[PDB]
Ligand binder design. Structure first.
Ligand SMILES: CNC(=O)c1cnc2cc(OC)c(OC)cc2c1Nc1ccc(Cl)cc1F
Length: 153
């Protein structure tokens, strides 16, 4: 009972782009860019499409960096999130849904991000690949988790 999602991190040598979500689920937190994979679409094509819809950026080469499953206690559907890292074109676009901002790598706003990010961002920043699972109670509490580095996602 899992649904496919993507998440894209635009990570440059000294900064990362994140978007402040204005509405819907996750509003008020800085996030990568992502959403649901569509019918007939590959996961990677979904990742490229969502980065444009949410940030206005065009990505050619995407690299898969992780897979994280999110469980919300009581909720039937698990989120199977395929995480990718990016060479981009365009300038980030602020829209009604998302306010993008560049962050220096020592200024990541973990306090205003989903709590799981604190666990897997140190891996992302060090160019590691990973598999994770986080079980949440509500939006603020991690009940339990697993996180492992892998050679292949
Ligand atoms: C830079 N880290 C993130 O951006 C990020 C981190 N953790 C998340 C945890 C979540 O629930 C437990 C979650 O539920 C909607 C969203 C998360 C999330 N963003 C995100 C946005 C849109 C999708 Cl489709 C998928 C995502 F993971």
């Amino acid at each position: 009972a899992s649904r496919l999602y993507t998440l894209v991190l635009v990570l440059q040598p000294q900064r990362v782009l994140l978007g402040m979500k204005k509405r819907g689920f996750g509003a008020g937190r800085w996030n990568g860019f992502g959403g649901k994979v569509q019918e007939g679409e590959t996961i990677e094509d979904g990742a490229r499409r969502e980065l444009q819809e949410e940030s206005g950026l065009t990505v050619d080469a995407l690299h898969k960096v992780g897979q994280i499953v999110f469980e919300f206690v009581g909720e039937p559907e698990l989120m199977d999130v395929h995480v990718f890292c990016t060479s981009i074109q365009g300038t980030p676009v602020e829209s009604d849904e998302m306010r993008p901002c560049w962050f220096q790598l020592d200024q990541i706003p973990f306090k205003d991000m989903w709590p799981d990010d604190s666990y897997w961002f140190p891996l992302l920043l060090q160019k590691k690949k990973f598999h994770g699972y986080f079980k949440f109670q509500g939006q603020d509490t991690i009940l339990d988790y697993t996180l492992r580095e892998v050679d292949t996602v």
